[PDB]
Amino acid sequence: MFWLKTRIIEGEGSLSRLSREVKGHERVLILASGSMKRHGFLSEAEDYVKEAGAEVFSIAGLPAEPSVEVIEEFLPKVREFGPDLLVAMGGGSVIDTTKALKVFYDAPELNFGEIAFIDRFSKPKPVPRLKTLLIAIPSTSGAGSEVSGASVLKKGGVKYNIVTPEIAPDVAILDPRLPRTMPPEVARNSGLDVLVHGIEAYTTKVASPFSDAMAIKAIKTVYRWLPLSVKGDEEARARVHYAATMAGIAFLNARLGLCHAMSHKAAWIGPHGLLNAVFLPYVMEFNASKSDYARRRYAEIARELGFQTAKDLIEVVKELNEMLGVPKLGELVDEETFASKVEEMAEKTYHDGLIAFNPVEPKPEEIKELYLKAYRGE
Amino acid sequence: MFWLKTRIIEGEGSLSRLSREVKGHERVLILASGSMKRHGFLSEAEDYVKEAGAEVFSIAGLPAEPSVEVIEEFLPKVREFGPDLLVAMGGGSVIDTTKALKVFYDAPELNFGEIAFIDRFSKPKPVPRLKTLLIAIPSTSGAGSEVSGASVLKKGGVKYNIVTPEIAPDVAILDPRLPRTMPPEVARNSGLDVLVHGIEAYTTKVASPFSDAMAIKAIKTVYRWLPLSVKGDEEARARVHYAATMAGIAFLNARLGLCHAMSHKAAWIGPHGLLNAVFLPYVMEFNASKSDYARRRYAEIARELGFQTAKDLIEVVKELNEMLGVPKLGELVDEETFASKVEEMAEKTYHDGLIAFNPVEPKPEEIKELYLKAYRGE
Ligand SMILES: Nc1ncnc2c1ncn2[C@@H]1O[C@H](COP(=O)(O)OP(=O)(O)O)[C@@H](O)[C@H]1OP(=O)(O)O
Ligand SMILES: Nc1ncnc2c1ncn2[C@@H]1O[C@H](COP(=O)(O)OP(=O)(O)O)[C@@H](O)[C@H]1OP(=O)(O)O
């Protein structure tokens, strides 16, 4: 299918639209990153909420890696306030944290381990109706959590997923002023996450014309604008910001692929968006070598960028990575350590449900060989 | 903003998904075109509904030009059956008819003249909550009514509009088998409607990146595939079918423009999609002459099609019209008659609320001159 729950508000100054969006709600809770507080954006959001006649309470300074345990720490405060509207302001992790909070707040009867999943050998129960409106306000460009029905967080040190349309945000507000405060490396990494989301969404087994429309526009936009953006160009930051959400609309519908999976299993090495960028060329090469469908799809993307072939697309991504100063795997982690982890990462990758949507189903050995090839870095 | 209420089901054989979609509903009413009945598609839809355990009742053979009076004729039968789900199967007009039925069925207390509008001097009341689920199944490619919140119909011989998210369909099913039965001229005209919707949506004052993504994909698809489709190529018919809905998603959000308005005011001359095709080159020329914004936007579309300039885009559309055998205005209607109607059409165009979204606000005289220029046909 193709669907989109979230209503998207976008444009310069569009944070102020929060006043209109909270109309009819009296008690607004905002979870925000430390950076949203420091830059004064949290106080602006609070001001916009109070303009509309609501009371507001904010919890700022959330851990970068969300966890059930930390959410359980402030859940009592949330229940004491009793919001009828939730706002997430910050990166993907802040949105993920707020999505999980929504589940716990709206359905306190649920057992976490019964509704979340670790991998394809989990069997989660479906989440029931979750009534509290959720507004997502991304400050990075970006993970696309502001339109997805997915959240990732730890419990007991282990990484879990929750996926349901019940936590896809009702509203996303895309005000490019917020991502203009990303430091350069965050702009680079989150930008490359957009590119990899787009390219993977375009080549899954369940891509539609409708998801493709969004994936192709996101890819073109990042390709043209990300380097200017990383160096602080104000318009480029806006263009890439909207592109991040486009890629989110794409992968919400088309899912993601082997690159996202391998990147997540290698997260100990460094930032997702960066590891995605490093692995993508190798994933594209692998997929094209084993699937004429994938090769043809990569060539279609190449033609949208002004080239011809799958090979061109792989070379374009590699050169963009260099332009943006993305390191080789070798420069992030030493051979001994990598080789010691490669087996478990390849198995955990193989155990990821996303593999089913990749245009090729890889064997654990192939994935292991793939990790090793990316490490050798040629 | 950007939003999409409708969930889109698309693909070969996807009419059978109706069984899944009627789950939880016991009484399904289907409004269908004569052609849907004759080709056996109505009986298939009925079969799919009965599979799911529901009862079904169908009203087939709807007038091509919907009217309140004709809807009021079969409303008693509808109320007697008491559907909890409505299905529209056919062209844009069948979907429009079913949307209006939904209003009358769900909110029988409303006065038609108080909630519908004729032009910008109307002041309609907002439509309240309309609860009955609506599934739209287009057989042409197409008007985009399957994703819009709009309906057009006559009352007392006068053309009215109803626009509310309450009549945007809950679900659209896009099964390319249905539009493969369009005759060639209907495939041509509805196809050119897609192209004009896309180009207008791309150049309104409220276009966003998100609507653009859909508009650009629709434009490219029609340009590449419509001529093959009109001659009966099965894959081309599928590609253009999905493109029609993309253009609908675009104009749902970005609105339409001077071409749609002038075409509707000249409907006495012939089929909408065709009149749209004839007028577009002249509208694009006008808009580009008065707006550097429009000119630049037309050049962006040109570059997506493999060219450079606004002038290129105007020449591309003109040559596509010739390839498809679209006539000159002169060959549809004689000069005396045209000149006698030109004043009222230009005034009624000027009185259309859509004019506000066109990148240029034209004067009644300019619109009159524009109609005359298109008639001279150079
Ligand atoms: N607009 C912004 N200004 C400054 N720093 C920002 C920022 N957006 C994100 N960051 C930083 O960039 C990092 C990435 O945040 P994240 O982990 O949510 O990213 P992602 O969106 O990929 O999930 C964080 O360390 C964040 O700092 P805070 O936790 O203190 O907010
Ligand atoms: N799939 C199909 N097979 C045959 N004729 C079709 C068709 N789809 C549309 N048409 C015809 O094409 C014409 C256009 O229908 P319409 O007015 O709903 O078009 P639109 O979609 O532009 O609103 C109608 O005369 C219709 O014939 P019926 O009214 O008898 O159905």
Short mmCIF file of N, CA and C in Angstrom, two decimals, chain B residues 231-368:
data_model
loop_
_atom_site.label_atom_id
_atom_site.label_comp_id
_atom_site.label_asym_id
_atom_site.label_seq_id
_atom_site.Cartn_x
_atom_site.Cartn_y
_atom_site.Cartn_z
N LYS B 231 -2.68 3.70 -27.24
CA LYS B 231 -2.73 2.61 -28.21
C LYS B 231 -2.86 1.20 -27.61
N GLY B 232 -3.01 1.09 -26.29
CA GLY B 232 -3.47 -0.13 -25.66
C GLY B 232 -2.38 -0.95 -24.99
N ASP B 233 -1.19 -0.38 -24.78
CA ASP B 233 -0.13 -1.13 -24.13
C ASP B 233 -0.49 -1.37 -22.67
N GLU B 234 -0.47 -2.63 -22.25
CA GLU B 234 -0.97 -2.97 -20.92
C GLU B 234 -0.14 -2.37 -19.78
N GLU B 235 1.19 -2.43 -19.90
CA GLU B 235 2.03 -1.86 -18.85
C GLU B 235 1.88 -0.35 -18.81
N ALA B 236 1.86 0.31 -19.96
CA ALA B 236 1.68 1.77 -19.98
C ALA B 236 0.38 2.21 -19.30
N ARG B 237 -0.68 1.46 -19.52
CA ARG B 237 -1.95 1.76 -18.83
C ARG B 237 -1.77 1.70 -17.32
N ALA B 238 -1.00 0.74 -16.82
CA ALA B 238 -0.76 0.67 -15.37
C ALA B 238 0.04 1.87 -14.89
N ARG B 239 1.09 2.21 -15.60
CA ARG B 239 1.97 3.30 -15.19
C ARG B 239 1.24 4.64 -15.15
N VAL B 240 0.42 4.90 -16.16
CA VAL B 240 -0.37 6.12 -16.19
C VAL B 240 -1.46 6.10 -15.14
N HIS B 241 -2.04 4.93 -14.87
CA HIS B 241 -3.05 4.85 -13.80
C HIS B 241 -2.49 5.33 -12.44
N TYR B 242 -1.31 4.86 -12.06
CA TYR B 242 -0.76 5.26 -10.76
C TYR B 242 -0.38 6.74 -10.81
N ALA B 243 0.15 7.17 -11.95
CA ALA B 243 0.48 8.59 -12.15
C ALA B 243 -0.73 9.51 -11.94
N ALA B 244 -1.93 9.10 -12.37
CA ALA B 244 -3.15 9.90 -12.16
C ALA B 244 -3.41 10.15 -10.68
N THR B 245 -3.26 9.12 -9.87
CA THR B 245 -3.40 9.29 -8.44
C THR B 245 -2.27 10.17 -7.84
N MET B 246 -1.03 10.05 -8.32
CA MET B 246 0.08 10.91 -7.87
C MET B 246 -0.27 12.37 -8.07
N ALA B 247 -0.79 12.67 -9.25
CA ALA B 247 -1.18 14.05 -9.59
C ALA B 247 -2.34 14.51 -8.73
N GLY B 248 -3.22 13.59 -8.38
CA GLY B 248 -4.26 13.86 -7.38
C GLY B 248 -3.73 14.19 -5.99
N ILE B 249 -2.72 13.46 -5.55
CA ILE B 249 -2.09 13.77 -4.28
C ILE B 249 -1.45 15.15 -4.35
N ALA B 250 -0.83 15.46 -5.49
CA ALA B 250 -0.26 16.77 -5.67
C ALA B 250 -1.30 17.89 -5.58
N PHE B 251 -2.40 17.78 -6.33
CA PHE B 251 -3.33 18.93 -6.40
C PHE B 251 -4.26 18.97 -5.19
N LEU B 252 -4.46 17.84 -4.52
CA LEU B 252 -5.14 17.83 -3.23
C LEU B 252 -4.44 18.84 -2.31
N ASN B 253 -3.12 18.87 -2.38
CA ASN B 253 -2.34 19.69 -1.47
C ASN B 253 -1.99 21.08 -2.06
N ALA B 254 -1.64 21.11 -3.32
CA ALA B 254 -1.13 22.34 -3.96
C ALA B 254 -2.23 23.14 -4.71
N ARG B 255 -3.41 22.55 -4.82
CA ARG B 255 -4.51 23.13 -5.59
C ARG B 255 -4.26 23.12 -7.08
N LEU B 256 -5.17 23.75 -7.82
CA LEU B 256 -5.04 23.89 -9.25
C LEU B 256 -5.10 25.33 -9.65
N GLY B 257 -5.09 25.59 -10.96
CA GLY B 257 -4.74 26.90 -11.45
C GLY B 257 -5.66 27.40 -12.55
N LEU B 258 -5.14 28.37 -13.28
CA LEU B 258 -5.89 29.10 -14.28
C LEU B 258 -6.37 28.18 -15.38
N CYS B 259 -5.56 27.17 -15.73
CA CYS B 259 -5.97 26.25 -16.78
C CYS B 259 -7.20 25.42 -16.40
N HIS B 260 -7.19 24.85 -15.21
CA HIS B 260 -8.35 24.11 -14.74
C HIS B 260 -9.60 25.00 -14.74
N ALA B 261 -9.44 26.23 -14.27
CA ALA B 261 -10.55 27.16 -14.16
C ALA B 261 -11.15 27.51 -15.53
N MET B 262 -10.30 27.91 -16.48
CA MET B 262 -10.72 28.27 -17.83
C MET B 262 -11.32 27.08 -18.55
N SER B 263 -10.76 25.90 -18.32
CA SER B 263 -11.29 24.66 -18.92
C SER B 263 -12.70 24.37 -18.44
N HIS B 264 -12.92 24.48 -17.14
CA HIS B 264 -14.24 24.24 -16.58
C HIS B 264 -15.28 25.24 -17.07
N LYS B 265 -14.90 26.50 -17.18
CA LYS B 265 -15.81 27.53 -17.70
C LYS B 265 -16.08 27.38 -19.21
N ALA B 266 -15.27 26.57 -19.89
CA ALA B 266 -15.46 26.29 -21.33
C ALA B 266 -15.95 24.87 -21.62
N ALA B 267 -16.52 24.22 -20.60
CA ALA B 267 -16.89 22.81 -20.67
C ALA B 267 -17.97 22.53 -21.73
N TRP B 268 -18.84 23.49 -21.95
CA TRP B 268 -19.74 23.44 -23.11
C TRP B 268 -19.03 23.09 -24.43
N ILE B 269 -17.73 23.39 -24.55
CA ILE B 269 -16.99 23.08 -25.79
C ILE B 269 -16.60 21.60 -25.94
N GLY B 270 -16.44 20.87 -24.83
CA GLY B 270 -15.97 19.49 -24.90
C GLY B 270 -15.37 18.95 -23.61
N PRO B 271 -14.73 17.77 -23.69
CA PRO B 271 -14.27 17.05 -22.50
C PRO B 271 -13.17 17.79 -21.71
N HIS B 272 -13.32 17.83 -20.39
CA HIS B 272 -12.44 18.60 -19.53
C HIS B 272 -10.97 18.36 -19.91
N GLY B 273 -10.54 17.10 -19.83
CA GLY B 273 -9.11 16.75 -19.99
C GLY B 273 -8.57 17.29 -21.31
N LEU B 274 -9.42 17.30 -22.32
CA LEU B 274 -9.05 17.75 -23.67
C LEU B 274 -8.92 19.28 -23.72
N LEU B 275 -9.91 19.96 -23.18
CA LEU B 275 -9.87 21.42 -23.08
C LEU B 275 -8.73 21.89 -22.20
N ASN B 276 -8.44 21.14 -21.14
CA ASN B 276 -7.24 21.40 -20.36
C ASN B 276 -6.01 21.31 -21.21
N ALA B 277 -5.94 20.28 -22.04
CA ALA B 277 -4.75 20.08 -22.85
C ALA B 277 -4.57 21.24 -23.83
N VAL B 278 -5.68 21.69 -24.40
CA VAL B 278 -5.65 22.75 -25.42
C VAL B 278 -5.23 24.07 -24.81
N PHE B 279 -5.79 24.39 -23.65
CA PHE B 279 -5.49 25.65 -23.00
C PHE B 279 -4.12 25.70 -22.35
N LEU B 280 -3.59 24.56 -21.89
CA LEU B 280 -2.36 24.63 -21.10
C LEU B 280 -1.23 25.41 -21.75
N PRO B 281 -0.93 25.15 -23.04
CA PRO B 281 0.21 25.88 -23.62
C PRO B 281 0.05 27.40 -23.52
N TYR B 282 -1.18 27.87 -23.63
CA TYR B 282 -1.45 29.30 -23.62
C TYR B 282 -1.38 29.86 -22.22
N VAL B 283 -1.83 29.07 -21.26
CA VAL B 283 -1.73 29.43 -19.84
C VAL B 283 -0.26 29.49 -19.40
N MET B 284 0.53 28.52 -19.84
CA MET B 284 1.93 28.48 -19.45
C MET B 284 2.65 29.70 -20.04
N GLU B 285 2.35 30.00 -21.30
CA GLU B 285 2.93 31.16 -21.95
C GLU B 285 2.55 32.44 -21.21
N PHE B 286 1.26 32.61 -20.91
CA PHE B 286 0.81 33.75 -20.13
C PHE B 286 1.54 33.84 -18.78
N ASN B 287 1.53 32.76 -18.01
CA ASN B 287 2.10 32.81 -16.66
C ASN B 287 3.59 33.13 -16.73
N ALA B 288 4.32 32.51 -17.66
CA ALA B 288 5.76 32.73 -17.78
C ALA B 288 6.05 34.17 -18.18
N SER B 289 5.21 34.75 -19.04
CA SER B 289 5.40 36.15 -19.47
C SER B 289 5.25 37.15 -18.31
N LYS B 290 4.48 36.80 -17.28
CA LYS B 290 4.20 37.73 -16.21
C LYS B 290 4.86 37.38 -14.88
N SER B 291 5.50 36.22 -14.78
CA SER B 291 6.06 35.75 -13.50
C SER B 291 7.39 35.03 -13.74
N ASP B 292 8.48 35.64 -13.28
CA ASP B 292 9.75 34.96 -13.29
C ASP B 292 9.70 33.67 -12.46
N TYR B 293 8.89 33.65 -11.40
CA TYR B 293 8.73 32.43 -10.58
C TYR B 293 8.18 31.29 -11.45
N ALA B 294 7.09 31.57 -12.16
CA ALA B 294 6.48 30.56 -13.01
C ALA B 294 7.46 30.09 -14.08
N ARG B 295 8.15 31.02 -14.72
CA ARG B 295 9.09 30.68 -15.79
C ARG B 295 10.14 29.71 -15.28
N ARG B 296 10.73 30.03 -14.14
CA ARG B 296 11.74 29.19 -13.50
C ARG B 296 11.18 27.79 -13.17
N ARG B 297 9.95 27.75 -12.66
CA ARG B 297 9.32 26.47 -12.32
C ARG B 297 9.06 25.65 -13.58
N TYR B 298 8.61 26.29 -14.66
CA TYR B 298 8.46 25.57 -15.92
C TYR B 298 9.79 25.03 -16.44
N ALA B 299 10.88 25.76 -16.19
CA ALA B 299 12.19 25.32 -16.64
C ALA B 299 12.64 24.11 -15.84
N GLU B 300 12.27 24.08 -14.56
CA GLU B 300 12.60 22.92 -13.72
C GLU B 300 11.92 21.67 -14.23
N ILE B 301 10.65 21.80 -14.61
CA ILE B 301 9.93 20.67 -15.20
C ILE B 301 10.57 20.22 -16.53
N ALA B 302 10.80 21.17 -17.43
CA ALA B 302 11.60 20.92 -18.65
C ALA B 302 12.88 20.12 -18.39
N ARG B 303 13.67 20.52 -17.40
CA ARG B 303 14.89 19.77 -17.08
C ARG B 303 14.63 18.32 -16.62
N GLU B 304 13.53 18.10 -15.89
CA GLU B 304 13.11 16.74 -15.52
C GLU B 304 12.73 15.90 -16.74
N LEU B 305 12.30 16.55 -17.82
CA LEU B 305 11.91 15.83 -19.02
C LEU B 305 13.06 15.70 -20.02
N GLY B 306 14.22 16.25 -19.67
CA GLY B 306 15.40 16.18 -20.52
C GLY B 306 15.70 17.42 -21.35
N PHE B 307 15.04 18.54 -21.05
CA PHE B 307 15.24 19.80 -21.77
C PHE B 307 15.74 20.89 -20.81
N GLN B 308 15.45 22.17 -21.07
CA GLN B 308 16.11 23.25 -20.32
C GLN B 308 15.18 24.37 -19.87
N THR B 309 14.29 24.81 -20.75
CA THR B 309 13.64 26.10 -20.59
C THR B 309 12.13 25.96 -20.48
N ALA B 310 11.48 27.02 -20.01
CA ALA B 310 10.03 27.14 -20.08
C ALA B 310 9.52 26.99 -21.51
N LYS B 311 10.19 27.65 -22.45
CA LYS B 311 9.82 27.56 -23.86
C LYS B 311 9.82 26.10 -24.31
N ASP B 312 10.81 25.35 -23.86
CA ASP B 312 10.89 23.92 -24.18
C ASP B 312 9.64 23.21 -23.67
N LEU B 313 9.24 23.52 -22.44
CA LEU B 313 8.10 22.81 -21.84
C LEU B 313 6.83 23.08 -22.63
N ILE B 314 6.65 24.32 -23.07
CA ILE B 314 5.49 24.70 -23.85
C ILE B 314 5.50 23.97 -25.20
N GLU B 315 6.67 23.87 -25.81
CA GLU B 315 6.79 23.15 -27.09
C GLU B 315 6.57 21.63 -26.92
N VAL B 316 7.07 21.06 -25.82
CA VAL B 316 6.85 19.64 -25.49
C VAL B 316 5.37 19.30 -25.34
N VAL B 317 4.64 20.14 -24.63
CA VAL B 317 3.21 19.91 -24.46
C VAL B 317 2.49 20.01 -25.80
N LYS B 318 2.84 21.02 -26.60
CA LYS B 318 2.20 21.22 -27.90
C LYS B 318 2.43 20.02 -28.82
N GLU B 319 3.65 19.49 -28.83
CA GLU B 319 3.97 18.32 -29.67
C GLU B 319 3.34 17.02 -29.19
N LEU B 320 3.23 16.86 -27.88
CA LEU B 320 2.48 15.75 -27.31
C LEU B 320 1.02 15.82 -27.69
N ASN B 321 0.44 17.01 -27.62
CA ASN B 321 -0.93 17.16 -28.06
C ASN B 321 -1.11 16.72 -29.53
N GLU B 322 -0.18 17.13 -30.38
CA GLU B 322 -0.26 16.74 -31.78
C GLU B 322 -0.14 15.22 -31.95
N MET B 323 0.87 14.63 -31.30
CA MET B 323 1.07 13.18 -31.32
C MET B 323 -0.20 12.43 -30.95
N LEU B 324 -0.94 12.98 -30.01
CA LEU B 324 -2.13 12.31 -29.53
C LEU B 324 -3.38 12.76 -30.30
N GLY B 325 -3.22 13.63 -31.30
CA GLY B 325 -4.37 14.04 -32.11
C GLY B 325 -5.36 14.97 -31.43
N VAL B 326 -4.87 15.77 -30.49
CA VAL B 326 -5.71 16.76 -29.82
C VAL B 326 -6.03 17.88 -30.82
N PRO B 327 -7.31 18.24 -30.97
CA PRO B 327 -7.64 19.24 -32.00
C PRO B 327 -7.37 20.66 -31.55
N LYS B 328 -7.37 21.59 -32.50
CA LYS B 328 -7.36 23.01 -32.19
C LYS B 328 -8.73 23.42 -31.69
N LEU B 329 -8.81 24.52 -30.94
CA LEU B 329 -10.11 25.01 -30.44
C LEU B 329 -11.08 25.24 -31.61
N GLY B 330 -10.55 25.80 -32.69
CA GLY B 330 -11.30 26.08 -33.91
C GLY B 330 -12.03 24.89 -34.51
N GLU B 331 -11.49 23.70 -34.31
CA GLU B 331 -12.05 22.49 -34.90
C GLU B 331 -13.16 21.93 -34.00
N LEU B 332 -13.29 22.48 -32.79
CA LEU B 332 -14.32 22.04 -31.86
C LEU B 332 -15.53 22.97 -31.88
N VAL B 333 -15.32 24.23 -32.23
CA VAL B 333 -16.36 25.25 -32.09
C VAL B 333 -16.04 26.47 -32.97
N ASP B 334 -17.08 27.09 -33.52
CA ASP B 334 -16.91 28.11 -34.54
C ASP B 334 -16.77 29.49 -33.89
N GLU B 335 -16.21 30.43 -34.65
CA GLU B 335 -15.70 31.68 -34.10
C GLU B 335 -16.83 32.51 -33.50
N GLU B 336 -17.93 32.58 -34.25
CA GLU B 336 -19.09 33.34 -33.84
C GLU B 336 -19.55 32.93 -32.44
N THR B 337 -19.69 31.63 -32.24
CA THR B 337 -20.19 31.09 -30.97
C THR B 337 -19.18 31.36 -29.83
N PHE B 338 -17.91 31.05 -30.07
CA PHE B 338 -16.84 31.33 -29.10
C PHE B 338 -16.83 32.80 -28.66
N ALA B 339 -16.77 33.71 -29.63
CA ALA B 339 -16.74 35.14 -29.32
C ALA B 339 -17.97 35.59 -28.52
N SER B 340 -19.10 34.91 -28.72
CA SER B 340 -20.33 35.25 -28.02
C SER B 340 -20.31 34.80 -26.56
N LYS B 341 -19.53 33.76 -26.26
CA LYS B 341 -19.43 33.23 -24.89
C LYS B 341 -18.21 33.74 -24.12
N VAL B 342 -17.25 34.34 -24.82
CA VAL B 342 -15.93 34.60 -24.26
C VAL B 342 -16.01 35.51 -23.04
N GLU B 343 -16.93 36.46 -23.07
CA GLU B 343 -17.02 37.45 -22.01
C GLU B 343 -17.45 36.81 -20.69
N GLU B 344 -18.46 35.94 -20.74
CA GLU B 344 -19.01 35.34 -19.52
C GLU B 344 -18.02 34.33 -18.95
N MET B 345 -17.36 33.56 -19.83
CA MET B 345 -16.36 32.57 -19.41
C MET B 345 -15.23 33.26 -18.68
N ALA B 346 -14.80 34.39 -19.23
CA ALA B 346 -13.69 35.15 -18.66
C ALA B 346 -14.06 35.76 -17.31
N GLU B 347 -15.32 36.21 -17.19
CA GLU B 347 -15.83 36.71 -15.91
C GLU B 347 -15.98 35.58 -14.89
N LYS B 348 -16.58 34.47 -15.31
CA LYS B 348 -16.75 33.31 -14.43
C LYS B 348 -15.39 32.73 -14.01
N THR B 349 -14.44 32.74 -14.94
CA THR B 349 -13.06 32.36 -14.59
C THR B 349 -12.51 33.29 -13.53
N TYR B 350 -12.65 34.58 -13.75
CA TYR B 350 -12.22 35.60 -12.79
C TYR B 350 -12.91 35.46 -11.43
N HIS B 351 -14.11 34.88 -11.42
CA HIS B 351 -14.88 34.71 -10.19
C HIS B 351 -14.56 33.39 -9.48
N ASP B 352 -13.70 32.58 -10.10
CA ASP B 352 -13.31 31.30 -9.52
C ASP B 352 -12.24 31.49 -8.43
N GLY B 353 -12.46 30.87 -7.27
CA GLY B 353 -11.51 30.99 -6.16
C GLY B 353 -10.11 30.47 -6.45
N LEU B 354 -9.97 29.63 -7.47
CA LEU B 354 -8.69 29.02 -7.79
C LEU B 354 -7.67 30.02 -8.28
N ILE B 355 -8.18 31.08 -8.90
CA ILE B 355 -7.35 32.15 -9.43
C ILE B 355 -6.35 32.66 -8.40
N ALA B 356 -6.76 32.69 -7.14
CA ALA B 356 -5.88 33.13 -6.05
C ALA B 356 -4.58 32.31 -5.91
N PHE B 357 -4.57 31.07 -6.41
CA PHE B 357 -3.39 30.20 -6.28
C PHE B 357 -2.50 30.22 -7.52
N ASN B 358 -3.04 30.69 -8.64
CA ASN B 358 -2.24 30.86 -9.85
C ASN B 358 -1.07 31.80 -9.56
N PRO B 359 0.10 31.53 -10.17
CA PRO B 359 1.28 32.34 -9.83
C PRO B 359 1.14 33.80 -10.26
N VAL B 360 0.20 34.05 -11.17
CA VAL B 360 -0.22 35.39 -11.59
C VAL B 360 -1.73 35.55 -11.37
N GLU B 361 -2.15 36.70 -10.84
CA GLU B 361 -3.58 37.05 -10.76
C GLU B 361 -3.99 37.77 -12.03
N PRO B 362 -4.77 37.12 -12.90
CA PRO B 362 -5.12 37.76 -14.17
C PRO B 362 -6.37 38.62 -14.09
N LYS B 363 -6.41 39.68 -14.88
CA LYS B 363 -7.61 40.51 -15.00
C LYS B 363 -8.63 39.88 -15.95
N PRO B 364 -9.92 40.21 -15.77
CA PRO B 364 -10.94 39.64 -16.65
C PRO B 364 -10.62 39.85 -18.13
N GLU B 365 -10.08 41.02 -18.47
CA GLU B 365 -9.66 41.31 -19.85
C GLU B 365 -8.52 40.44 -20.33
N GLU B 366 -7.53 40.23 -19.47
CA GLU B 366 -6.42 39.33 -19.79
C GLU B 366 -6.93 37.91 -20.07
N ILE B 367 -7.83 37.42 -19.22
CA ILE B 367 -8.40 36.09 -19.39
C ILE B 367 -9.17 36.04 -20.71
N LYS B 368 -9.90 37.11 -21.03
CA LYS B 368 -10.63 37.18 -22.29
C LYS B 368 -9.66 37.13 -23.47
#
